[PDB]
Design a protein around this ligand. Structure first.
Ligand SMILES: CCCc1cc(=O)n2nc(CC(=O)N3CCCC3)c(C#N)c2[nH]1
Ligand SMILES: CCCc1cc(=O)n2nc(CC(=O)N3CCCC3)c(C#N)c2[nH]1
Ligand SMILES: *Cc1c(COP(=O)(O)O)cnc(C)c1O
Ligand SMILES: *Cc1c(COP(=O)(O)O)cnc(C)c1O
Ligand SMILES: [Cl-]
Ligand SMILES: [Cl-]
Lengths: 353, 353
């Protein structure tokens, strides 16, 4: 059925690495990792063990047929020195959905969260407490069948590694030639296979003077995501109503935890209309011409909320007036999230470690 | 950047040769493997070494962001005990295109072929010679950056493993809800990410009483591929002309080596029209009602040519009269391929080891 946190085997490191004294995202790892193997017998006992290489059979289905998925969440240390995870239950939910989509074994969501709690507790001294710092948690589940048949694996590995990590607007390339995901595809799951093919496109954005990719979809050039983040637009819509809009969860949008949190927050304030609806380049162009756009930004765990100041759409260089509008909404979201995350105000959304 | 060279080959023979079999596809492996490492210093020296595990950093981009691609080709041992590869240059061409698509390092196609030649030569005794047997050759290129940033890797591994391997018609489920690939995507490259998402779809086909998936595309329900195989239809077309048709390479089709060979053979014969044209379910239904369909089949390395006798579409079973028609074209294809592959007829398609 599932591994249990009660059965956790703890193996402390004998070679602790020197902590940092900048923090480049996703390149510095803590002393320990979580590791749980699965096979015909079911799940093994979970272990917190020293950070170490994986040993994999050359035919492992994780490396041939991309039987792999991952999560990303953050732990924050408040002034009171208490470390708390941001809405981890949602990541656990999402990870399990990913596993079912790739025919990888299910596990108990609260059991994995506790194992992750235990892991972070072990490496708690790696959690930085400087302003705007955090610990990035990366769970991974891979198939590990030593067979070249494309099939449901009979073996799997679940592991978790940790990274300590340390508002500048960005430019985006919007070219309809590039496609991240399609309806009937798997772009709405956090699977490794969705990321590899984007590397070349990101290089092309850099080649054309932009920092990231604005992923367009469909004949009407829907704005779906920005880089690895969900996209939000704050504008006065064609009906004259002030609203926050983000694309709906219709197959091509990854259901971000930050995304859902911004919707929940804005919805709760009740000061302007908050909707999930498709957004087209055509609508954006008109809105920019009519001075109705206030702010455009991306949302996601690693970078949180990221303002957009420019979109290159074919040869048209479009100025996005996010920064000339405060950015009032971005700043308000960042302020409220910081209060919740760093335990300034106690909250339902934080899970203490 | 410059390639590894077959001249620089380091050989390390095994100490404990494993027992040969007296075979389920892709489960049994040979004694050696090829391994080449790439980094900021370029390609290292290729080496044939004993079959062994891969040791990878747990942040390896091969496991998080699917920086992985593979190839598949067969070696055949004729009665003269001579071993030959089938059109290996085409696999090398396709591997380099896949590599470029994932921003993985370029290499010299002739140099890699020579390394694989040397590898099979070292393991020549694993190549079985019984009727309908072959050695499956699985090259793989993976990213190996120990970083959670989605980026072009600065490290990579190319390895090759070998497997000895050993007309029954199949039924297909044709459900448009499942989409294998999209125009503008990566369905036309042999990347791991294209295969994982199909596992569940195949389970659903089995649940609905079908053996494999017929992958449909577009609002007009184009037949693109069958399972992991290209699709062919032999019929009298709407203009009353007998033809063999397969979908064109428009982006959603993997350019199969077997596919191209069947086109080449049928063109060489000059007995009927050979065309690359899209094929819709609407055309198939009409042709089936008018009795114009002779044979429907898949092509691919592992299974060669596979007849189809039934398709489940919109909850109704369509009988496909392939076996009723001989299947003459399928049998002729299989015989000519066999004669070429096992050396009965000399042919420039075969590459001696
Ligand atoms: C996939 C989850 C981890 C992760 C990897 C990675 O490379 N990035 N890169 C970004 C930045 C991004 O997508 N941007 C910056 C400006 C707008 C788009 C993020 C995030 N967040 C991220 N996450
Ligand atoms: C990915 C290349 C290796 C490979 C793996 C695998 O699982 N299969 N399965 C098939 C059979 C298939 O796709 N069928 C059988 C009936 C019609 C479709 C093949 C092949 N060829 C293959 N290859
Ligand atoms: C991870 C991710 C997001 C944002 O997800 P969060 O759960 O908010 O971090 C958005 N789009 C893509 C493609 C992603 O991989
Ligand atoms: C491997 C493959 C084929 C067939 O390719 P061959 O080179 O003929 O073996 C067809 N379709 C898909 C999706 C494949 O992966
Ligand atoms: Cl929550
Ligand atoms: Cl050839």
């Amino acid at each position: 059925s599932s591994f249990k946190a009660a059965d956790l085997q703890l193996e402390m490191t004998q070679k602790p690495h020197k902590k940092p004294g900048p923090l480049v995202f996703g390149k510095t790892f803590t002393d320990h990792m979580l590791m749980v193997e699965w096979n015909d017998k079911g799940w093994g006992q979970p272990r917190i063990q020293p950070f170490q290489n994986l040993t994999l059979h050359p035919a492992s289905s994780s490396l041939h047929y991309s039987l792999q998925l991952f999560e990303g969440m953050k732990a924050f240390k408040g002034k009171d020195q208490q470390v708390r995870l941001f809405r981890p239950w949602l990541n656990m939910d999402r990870m399990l959905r990913s596993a079912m989509r790739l025919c990888l074994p299910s596990f108990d969501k609260l059991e994995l969260l506790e194992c992750i709690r235990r892991l972070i507790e072990v490496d708690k001294d790696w959690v930085p407490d400087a302003a705007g710092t955090s610990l990035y948690v990366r769970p991974v589940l891979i198939g590990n069948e030593p067979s070249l048949g494309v099939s449901q694996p009979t073996r799997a590995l679940l592991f978790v590694i940790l990274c300590p990590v340390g508002v500048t607007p960005v430019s985006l390339l919007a070219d309809p030639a590039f496609i991240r995901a399609w309806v009937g595809g798997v772009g709405n799951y956090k699977l490794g296979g969705n990321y590899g093919p984007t590397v070349l496109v990101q290089q092309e954005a850099l080649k054309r003077g932009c920092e990231q990719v604005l992923w367009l979809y469909g004949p009407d050039h829907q704005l779906t995501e920005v880089g690895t983040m969900n996209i939000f637009v704050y504008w006065t819509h064609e009906d004259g109503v002030l609203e926050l809009v983000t694309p709906p969860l219709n197959g091509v949008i990854l259901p971000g935890v930050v995304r859902q949190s911004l919707l929940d927050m804005a919805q709760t304030w009740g000061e302007f209309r908050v909707v999930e609806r498709t957004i087209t380049m055509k609508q954006l162009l008109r809105a920019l011409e009519e001075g109705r756009v206030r702010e455009v930004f991306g949302s996601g765990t690693a970078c949180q909320v990221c303002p957009v100041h420019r979109i290159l759409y074919k040869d048209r260089n479009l100025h996005i007036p996010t920064m000339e509008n405060g950015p009032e909404l971005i700043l308000r979201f960042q302020k409220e999230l910081k209060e919740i995350q760093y335990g300034i105000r106690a909250h339902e959304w934080m899970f203490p470690v």
